[PDB]
Amino acid sequence: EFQSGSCRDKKNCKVVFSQQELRKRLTPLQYHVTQEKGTESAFEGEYTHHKDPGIYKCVVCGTPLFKSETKFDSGSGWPSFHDVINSEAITFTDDFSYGMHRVETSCSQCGAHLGHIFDDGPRPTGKRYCINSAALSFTPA
Amino acid sequence: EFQSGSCRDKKNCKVVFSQQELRKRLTPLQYHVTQEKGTESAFEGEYTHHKDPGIYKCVVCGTPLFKSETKFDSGSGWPSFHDVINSEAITFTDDFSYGMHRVETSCSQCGAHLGHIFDDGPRPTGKRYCINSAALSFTPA
Ligand SMILES: [Cl-]
Ligand SMILES: [Zn+2]
Ligand SMILES: [Zn+2]
């Protein structure tokens, strides 16, 4: 159960940035993914096969999102995680694009589009997060 | 364990087609996928969310490849099957593109590129055949 929509949809993001700042700080791909609900090409993401210990953060606002301990590589075209660093970090939206229903995931502080979540992950959580590398930055442990 | 290479690599395909014939018959996308080892964009394939009972065949030569009973949908960008219709239908090749090791799958009869096989699949096989929709045709039951 969840109220559907990003904090941009709900008009209540805690963190905001000017477009001038966003355009000069983000690459065009990072901007398109996080600001226009884009998806990075499969197998081209910088963090798809990254295994270093550390924390993945929102590329836009720097809020921590995922711990390296929860990352796994099984052959998906994009980074995959078992769990979010804490329940407050991500917001959910019902997504009906491409002729299917998915649950889209966004940063709860600035509203950046991140990826999608699926209900078929192993225990304990039962979840699997498919996340665009272009939506993340990485801080080594 | 397998000898690596398509029947084109091994110079022993049972069936061959003229390249003018193939161009007339296949769309540019089907040609690029099957003849140039291409990959279709995620979520755009005709059979990605297809559920009708029947049999999927090689789009080039017509050989049966997959039964609808083995198809599953876990949210992948491409059609997913857990087993091939018979052990002789598909040939395997070690593939090192995109900074990865994958096992590429091709039609044993004509050498057409189909997709890849992974070890992250469900029981009973543990295998996921990740197959481009553009490499397939479908015959309803
Ligand atoms: Cl893609
Ligand atoms: Zn953010
Ligand atoms: Zn064939």
Q: CB–CB of B75 and A116 under 8 A? A: yes
Q: Which residues contact B70 (CB under 8 A, 6 or more apart)?
A: B81, B82, B83
Q: Tell me if residue A130 is catalytic.
A: yes
Q: CB–CB of A118 and B49 under 8 A? A: no
Length of chain A as a residue count = 141
Alpha-carbon gap: B1 to the closest alpha carbon of chain A (Å): 19
d(CA A6, CA B97): 36
Q: How was this structure determined?
A: X-ray
CA nearest to B82, candidates B39, B112, B120, B133: B120
User: Within an 8 Å CB–CB cutoff, is residue A130 touching chain B?
Assistant: yes
Q: Where are the domains of chain B?
A: 1-141
Catalytic positions of B are 130
DSSP letter string, B45-57: -TTTT---SEEEE
- Tell me the backbone φ, ψ of residue B34, rounded to 5 degrees: -80, -30
Which helix (H) or strand (E) element contains residue A30? helix A28-35
- Tell me the backbone φ, ψ of residue B80, rounded to 5 degrees: -135, 130
Q: What is the stated resolution of the deposited model, in angstroms? A: 1.7
Distance of alpha carbon B18 from the chain centroid: 20
Q: Residue A34 C-alpha to ligand 2 middle, in angstroms? A: 9
SS3 state of residue B6: coil
Angstrom distances, CA of residue B9 to CA of A91, A98, B17, B99? 49, 36, 16, 22
